[PDB]
Design a binder for this molecule. Structure first.
Ligand SMILES: [Ca+2]
Ligand SMILES: [Ca+2]
Ligand SMILES: [Ca+2]
Ligand SMILES: [Ca+2]
Lengths: 88, 88
């Protein structure tokens, strides 16, 4: 179904980016920056300043280890999706 | 991107099902049952008993109004996606 394909896509995109550097199952700041800039260009302003990268990570990093894990990424997707469902 | 397409798909599937009966922005039990059976057949056992419908709704309905709203649906998707990311 389209829903199953959506679930597969969320897993795949997280792993494409999380696997680049360091912990292969978490997004460091550089990985999260590239994910947003490359994959969310219709929904979010391009990130071009360290201050914005820092603030985004600070927001998403609920457990405070400085990285975005899969559960934190799902919370981010839920934010984006809700903002879209409510833009209209 | 595939991520943007995934976000659009989550909004679309919720609205296809939520719009059938009653509140057009929430899933009642019958709507949630059909969503799971029709759209999540690879990830979840088909629901064939009232007891299972009831228990699923009870689990997803965080705010206790007896229906699944968009935020509760996103939490459900996060459950499914995490179970999949961890099946392997
Ligand atoms: Ca990483
Ligand atoms: Ca974290
Ligand atoms: Ca409804
Ligand atoms: Ca509810």
């Amino acid at each position: 179904s389209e829903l199953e394909k959506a679930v597969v896509a969320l897993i795949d995109v997280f792993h494409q980016y999380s696997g680049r550097e360091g912990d292969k199952h978490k997004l460091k700041k550089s990985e999260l920056k590239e994910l947003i800039n490359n994959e969310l260009s219709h929904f979010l302003e391009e990130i071009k300043e360290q201050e914005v990268v820092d603030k985004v990570m600070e927001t998403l990093d609920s457990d405070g280890d400085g990285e975005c894990d899969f559960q934190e990424f799902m919370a981010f997707v839920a934010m984006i999706t809700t903002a879209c469902h409510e833009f209209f």
